[PDB]
Design a binder for this molecule. Structure first.
Ligand SMILES: O=c1c(C/C=C/c2ccccc2)c(O)ccn1Cc1ccc(Cl)cc1Cl
Length: 135
């Protein structure tokens, strides 16, 4: 079939987090923004419309939103308000999302396992891991 939609679409609520503070520090996020973002526990809404995929994150603190095609690079404004250039691909059924800015790079992987959606953020060997369930 064409199973990528059925795997990822829906509304996901955070249920665990590792070293997110550390990840945000390494990306350069300010100390107050880090803490408040860490407490926000935002939902992640994934949707599909033909070739165009969208990932919304919603909290009382801040909303964000990206729409993209796989393989196409696009400008993105991140939750801490960095301007970045992003490319998202489907590699072995995982969504792999790369962010380039000022000669740096961070990678965000989103992978389904069982009833869960696991997100891994890497920045120069600081690694954060967050788990989500359907809400
Ligand atoms: O963008 C995301 C999201 C999606 C929403 C996050 C998000 C977090 C808090 C509030 C709203 C949205 C994740 O699950 C995990 C990582 N990142 C990267 C990131 C996350 C946070 C910050 Cl500050 C900076 C950066 Cl580069």
């Amino acid at each position: 079939g064409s199973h990528m939609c059925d795997a990822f679409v829906g509304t996901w609520k955070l249920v665990s987090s590792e070293n997110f503070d550390d990840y945000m520090k390494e990306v350069g996020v300010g100390f107050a923004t880090r803490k408040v973002a860490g407490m926000a526990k935002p939902n992640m809404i994934i949707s599909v419309n033909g070739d165009v995929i969208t990932i919304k994150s919603e909290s009382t603190f801040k909303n964000t939103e990206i729409s993209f095609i796989l393989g196409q690079e696009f400008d993105e404004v991140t939750a801490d308000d960095r301007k970045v250039k992003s490319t998202i691909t489907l590699d072995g059924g995982v969504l792999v999302h790369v962010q380039k800015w000022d000669g740096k790079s961070t990678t965000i992987k989103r992978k389904r396992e069982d009833d869960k959606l696991v997100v891994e953020c890497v920045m120069k060997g600081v690694t954060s891991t967050r788990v989500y369930e359907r809400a």
